[PDB]
Design a protein around this ligand. Structure first.
Ligand SMILES: C=C1/C(=C\C=C2/CCC[C@@]3(C)[C@H]2CC[C@]3(C)C#CC#CC(O)(C(F)(F)F)C(F)(F)F)C[C@@H](O)C[C@@H]1O
Ligand SMILES: C=C1/C(=C\C=C2/CCC[C@@]3(C)[C@H]2CC[C@]3(C)C#CC#CC(O)(C(F)(F)F)C(F)(F)F)C[C@@H](O)C[C@@H]1O
Lengths: 10, 238, 238, 10
């Protein structure tokens, strides 16, 4: 999962 | 000896990354849910969630990190995050009043403040003892930022896949520190060892926090006061 | 005619429930993440999350609601919540400045404020038009609180199971309103119809909000600014 | 699911 971490990692 | 151009660069990009992800004015804290004296849980959740984002921006600028697989980057971040936070938070820690001072009296957190956010003395006591020891090592900016990147690039985390590549990264970084201290730091021939031990302390600290956060997050009345990012990072999804 | 003791009781427990879940001073808003002029998303997410809890406490005191299965209670709440919020928020809406005024200038939200929280004119325009019409019906406390409980106990929601029991509840309540107006409200022989239509408007409004929230929640940079409860209630898990 | 709603509904 980790939707937010993926985004924040651009 | 003297440091190579590559080592020197590493130091440079690391210190730059630190400045870009640490606001010494703490002015952004007025955007958090206010502190209240579990009255302190909303504000500290807002504080940690903020720091996690900064820790992420920092890691993104570590040489080599960006070139790992996302899986690994998430794995390193999910397990080192609170340690980077404890590490970076030394900058606001003060020995004169034994607390983290962040631009005001409202943003000054002692042990009693964090006890109102759902944590016990079992964590907060070794933590303060940790922050003092670390404070007492009087680290250079270069050393402080190195130590954090070393902690991030630990290959002995649950979930890492390319432990070979991550170990190479961490060693490269440790050489830079071991070197830096030798050359640029007078009277620190035990310091490297002292910093390495500081890492071992952080693991204990990570464990105690994880126990307590698990206790906290298992109660919906409290976990609802946490943030989606906190929940993601400190949560246990694979 | 005159209302029965049972009907009278229903009104009584409903108005009490409203007072217990609505703080006319809005003093709790200083505990939200501050308003900023998507700069307004953190504060309005904090506002809605707060209101959802109040809407839950209200529903818990509606006669019969507590005696439904949890499944159904969650189903009714997950789909009516934003409508109750729009409904209850009429109490703070002001015609003189066309905005929701909540104890200060910082807590005064016009259309432009909510546009900085990720919503479009497509929602906010019919919404304000809604709030004005509803404002213009000059409802009694008893009528306002009835209308909300009617909206909560709508059986035509996705997910309900005992539609038979919920319809019985809603009818019982509608009789109370239809009756109340007849007896206790002078010059309101079209009012019941006008209130029923207000319900039909809310469904459209629910739909537009759901479209926009779905847009908003699908972007992690924005959904991370939402709250665990908001995400639970407005999210689509079965 | 709905961990929070269940709690809030006591
Ligand atoms: C975080 C920083 C600073 C102070 C740090 C401080 C002072 C306040 C307390 C902190 C946050 C401490 C470091 C760690 C500790 C004892 C904690 C915690 C916690 C927790 C939670 O379980 C809780 F409670 F639910 F919120 C979690 F996971 F949800 F967040 C201030 C600046 O140096 C920036 C730095 O980035
Ligand atoms: C909520 C109340 C009051 C004002 C209400 C107001 C004035 C402000 C805007 C509100 C909140 C409006 C009613 C509905 C509306 C236009 C909205 C929205 C939204 C949204 C979100 O998508 C967002 F943006 F992400 F936050 C969601 F779902 F995440 F929350 C104030 C008092 O009457 C109490 C009452 O309980």
């Amino acid at each position: 999962r980790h939707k937010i971490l993926h985004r924040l990692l651009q | 000896h003297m440091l190579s151009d590559e080592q020197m660069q590493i130091i440079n990009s690391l210190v730059e990354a630190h400045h870009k992800t640490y606001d010494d004015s703490y002015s952004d804290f007025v955007r958090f849910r206010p502190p209240v004296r579990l009255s302190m849980l909303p504000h500290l959740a807002d504080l940690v969630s903020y720091s996690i984002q900064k820790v992420i921006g920092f890691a993104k600028m570590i040489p080599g990190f960006r070139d790992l697989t996302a899986e690994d980057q998430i794995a390193l971040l999910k397990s080192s995050a609170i340690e980077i936070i404890m590490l970076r938070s030394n900058q606001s820690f003060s020995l004169e009043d034994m607390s983290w001072s962040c631009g005001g009296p409202d943003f000054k957190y002692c042990i009693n403040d964090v006890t109102k956010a759902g944590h016990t003395l079992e964590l907060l006591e070794p933590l303060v003892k940790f922050q003092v020891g670390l404070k007492k090592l009087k680290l250079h900016e270069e050393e402080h930022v190195l130590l954090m990147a070393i902690c991030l690039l630990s290959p002995d985390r649950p979930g890492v896949q390319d432990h070979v590549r991550i170990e190479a990264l961490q060693d490269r970084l440790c050489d830079v520190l071991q070197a830096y201290i030798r050359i640029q730091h007078p009277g620190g021939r035990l310091l490297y060892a002292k910093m390495i031990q500081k890492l071992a302390d952080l693991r204990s600290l990570n464990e105690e926090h994880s126990k307590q956060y698990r206790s906290l997050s298992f109660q919906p009345e409290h976990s609802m006061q946490l943030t989606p990012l906190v929940l993601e990072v400190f949560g246990s999804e694979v």
